[PDB]
Design a protein around this nucleic acid. Structure first.
Lengths: 72, 72
DNA sequence: ATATGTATACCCG
DNA sequence: TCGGGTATACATA
């Protein structure tokens, strides 16, 4: 099924990743497999890959808030 | 005010992380800072679907004949 | 009809 | 609204 995982960041370092163009959908799930298998920490070598990607993120858009109480 | 970031995933390895004991909250956004700091380039996920097909056809073509004349 | 992201009432404090 | 994380409700693609 579809499980909505929500990491209420605003602190750790979420806004940047998506600020560039990756609202963790593929990131989390990717990190997940790695963190899932190894669950601790790993190490690799030089990227050995060219970085030719742009931005212009345009998918995520929402947000609201209206104070009218406090809750008891 | 914090910020809710949610990957509507489940089986994309996400569940496995929290399945252990970490809803990834701290991991996700932390990890992001790493990919947000380094942001080299996303790994374009390629497919593997074929696009070939056959035909093989052979019907027939039959016809009739006529007599006629002129009649005197 | 999904896929994806998000807000929000709730929970305890 | 209070928040992590939730579902659903809702927005958006």
């Amino acid at each position: 099924m579809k499980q909505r995982i929500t990491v209420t960041v605003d602190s750790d370092s979420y806004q940047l990743l998506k600020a560039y163009d990756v609202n963790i959908s593929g990131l989390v799930s990717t990190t997940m497999q790695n963190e899932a298998r190894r669950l601790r920490a790993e190490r690799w070598k030089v990227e050995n890959q060219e970085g030719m990607v742009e931005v212009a993120r345009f998918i995520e858009m929402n947000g609201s808030f209206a104070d009218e109480n406090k809750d008891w």
